[PDB]
């Protein structure tokens, strides 16, 4: 009885991936108007985004992350990242300042990881000028809500150990745990990897 287990899990993922607007029931999360911001938030599949929006999101990711990727074991390759960001399974939360200028986004997916239904956050990226205003925390709280409303078991993400601000944001401010799949949770002599996998159960 091993296919029955993954079938219940994959059914829930497949259903979430057929949703229209995962935030339709939650209009209060479509605005963030604190600390000088006036943002409107939308949740769309990548197929619903304009090409210039995808370009902005890729460029913001590259600006913020390219050096940190090269400092890691992964490296940075434009094509690999663009293909990941434009996969048909990609979902986006996009924050538009004054409903007009894109200033932040998350790329997330409903997927199976280690036999569990999860919401995987593949990116959370803010322009520098909108940081330390609570917007990133709010976007992650939206992800947590969507994980609950679709019956996922956790929100998961990867963070570089050398991305010290993001590590403190997730681990301390948002109290994500180190996931059992993280490299640090294998081996009893302190292995050496440059990222951690973090998660927060629903």
């Amino acid at each position: 009885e091993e296919r029955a287990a993954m079938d219940a899990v994959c059914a829930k993922v497949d259903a979430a991936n057929r949703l229209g607007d995962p935030l339709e029931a939650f209009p209060v999360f479509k605005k963030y108007d604190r600390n000088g911001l006036n943002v409107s938030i939308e949740c769309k599949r990548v197929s619903g985004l304009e090409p210039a929006t995808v370009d902005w999101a890729f460029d913001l990711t590259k600006t913020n992350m390219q050096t940190m990727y090269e400092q890691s074991e992964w490296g940075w390759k434009d094509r690999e990242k663009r293909e990941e960001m434009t996969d048909d399974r990609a979902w986006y939360l996009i924050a538009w300042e004054n409903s007009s200028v894109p200033v932040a986004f998350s790329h997330f997916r409903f997927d199976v990881e280690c036999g569990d239904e999860v919401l995987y956050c593949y990116e959370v990226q803010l322009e520098s000028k909108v940081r330390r205003k609570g917007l990133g925390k709010f976007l992650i709280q939206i992800l947590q809500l969507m994980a609950n409303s679709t019956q996922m078991k956790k929100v998961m993400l990867t963070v570089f150990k050398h991305n010290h601000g993001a590590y403190q944001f997730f681990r301390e401010a948002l109290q994500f745990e180190i996931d059992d799949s993280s490299p640090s949770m294998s081996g009893c002599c302190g292995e050496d990897c440059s990222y951690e996998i973090l998660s927060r159960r629903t």
Partner: peptide
């Protein structure tokens, strides 16, 4: 960012 193993 990204999806590690």
């Amino acid at each position: 960012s990204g999806r590690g193993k």
